[PDB]
Design a binder for this molecule. Structure first.
Ligand SMILES: CC(C)CNC(=O)[C@@H](NC[C@H](Cc1ccccc1)NC(=O)c1cc(C(=O)N[C@H](C)c2ccccc2)cc(N(C)S(C)(=O)=O)c1)[C@@H](C)O
Ligand SMILES: NC(=O)[C@@H]1CCCN1
Length: 387
């Protein structure tokens, strides 16, 4: 799928987005790819952080549904008006689809200054779309209206170091292959875990390790409430109990250096002289997921290069600085960009499963690399899922 390879732009901490056009004549907009929601929405009125926005009055194909819509996210929220219009993806399959579109009229802490995206593409299921499950999500409309296979895959590429606005604009930020899988985006084998239920892209974690050492918690604690794959979330987010235990372990593994509590809470950056970041003192983190085969599991392992996110501390500073991107949640585990930047993730909706393979663009050093390995069968499974 050469045509779609490299169709994403973006950065760590900012958001990965794809170019789409809406209405007639086509209006071009950068749309954030978000597997943590199911609404297709675009800025539709002026906003400080928006360089452009959808102008319904200039689209001859716009259809006003005369209904309001409200969408609150873990971070940010917005309000808008529902309609439908023709939508296309310049660097995706060659099709045009009539889709539901939330025209954003008011928002709070949703749009990000300097992000370059103006809308969001909720790729999860109807069950969680607002106002309710009757508002057909975009991917669903795409599959019903075309011959595109009911599957998409994502490769989000972090850089390992900061990028200014010009570099971010002139750089490839990943690929979103619509309807298929591109072997050039990963190495090794693709391991699949079941989509537990079709609402969020829900999965079940069966074990967690920090540098091979078992966190040793009841696996229900790992999925307490739920565990999901969310490309629209920056961090690897963990339930309070798991988070406290994981952080105590990461601290113990990296104790040759002491960091303020603010670092561990993600409130302050840590910096080292240019090129001297001590990646090796930080542990790798492994999450074991249920396999498709009964009593079988596999694990995905990330490196500190995935969980210590680069941040530019000023313009002529000779320091490499980062923020700890693992934080706590009171709404289950959220495998955000920190996990996704390490793997090629296949959302196989047709077979209700998610595949993971080491990403061809994941960041690493000469000594360690991200990994996807299995199978494991000593595993004490299911009672791991929450109810
Ligand atoms: C179904 C829907 C009504 C609710 N579902 C969501 O809220 C889900 N998350 C999807 C939203 C989508 C979104 C929200 C705001 C701006 C852009 C997209 N994402 C978040 O809620 C979310 C986004 C962000 C975030 O900054 N996302 C940006 C755009 C981003 C940067 C880098 C990579 C990917 C995304 C952060 C966090 N934090 C919780 S954190 C500090 O732990 O990572 C959460 C999930 C938490 O259930
Ligand atoms: N995310 C990006 O901007 C990529 C990563 C390396 C340079 N381009």
């Amino acid at each position: 799928f050469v045509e779609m390879v490299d169709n994403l732009r973006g950065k760590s901490g900012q958001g990965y987005y794809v170019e789409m056009t809406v209405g007639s004549p086509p209006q071009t907009l950068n749309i954030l790819v978000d597997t943590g929601s199911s609404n297709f929405a675009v800025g539709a009125a002026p906003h400080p952080f928006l360089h452009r926005y959808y102008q319904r009055q200039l689209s001859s194909t716009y259809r006003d549904l005369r209904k309001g819509v409200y969408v609150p996210y873990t971070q940010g929220k917005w309000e808008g008006e529902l309609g439908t219009d023709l939508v296309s993806i310049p660097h995706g399959p060659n099709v045009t689809v009539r889709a539901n579109i939330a025209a954003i009229t008011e928002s709070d802490k949703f749009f990000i200054n300097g992000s370059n995206w103006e809308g969001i593409l909720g790729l999860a299921y109807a069950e969680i779309a607002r106002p309710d499950d009757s508002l057909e999500p975009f991917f669903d409309s795409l599959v019903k209206q075309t011959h595109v296979p009911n599957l998409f895959s994502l490769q989000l590429c972090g850089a390992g170091f900061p990028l200014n606005q010009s570099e971010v604009l002139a750089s490839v930020g990943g690929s979103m292959i619509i309807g298929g899988i591109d072997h050039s985006l990963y190495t090794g084998s693709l391991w699949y875990t079941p989509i537990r239920r079709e609402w969020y892209y829900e999965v079940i974690i069966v074990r967690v390790e920090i540098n091979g050492q078992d966190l040793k918690m009841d696996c229900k604690e790992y999925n307490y409430d739920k565990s999901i794959v969310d490309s629209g979330t920056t961090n690897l987010r963990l339930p309070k109990k798991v988070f406290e235990a994981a952080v105590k372990s990461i601290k113990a593994a990296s104790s040759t250096e002491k960091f303020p509590d603010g670092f561990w809470l993600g409130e302050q950056l840590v910096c080292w002289q240019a090129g001297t970041t001590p990646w090796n003192i930080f542990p790798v983190i492994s999450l074991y997921l249920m396999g498709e085969v009964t009593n079988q599991s596999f694990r995905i392992t990330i490196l500190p290069q995935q969980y210590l996110r680069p941040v530019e501390d000023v313009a002529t500073s000779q320091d490499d600085c980062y923020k700890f991107a693992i934080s706590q949640s009171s709404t289950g585990t959220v495998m955000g960009a920190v996990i996704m930047e390490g793997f090629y993730v296949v959302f196989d909706r047709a077979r209700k499963r998610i595949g993971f393979a080491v990403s061809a663009c994941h960041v690493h050093d000469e000594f360690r690399t991200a990994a996807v390995e299995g199978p494991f069968v000593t595993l004490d499974m299911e009672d791991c899922g929450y109810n």
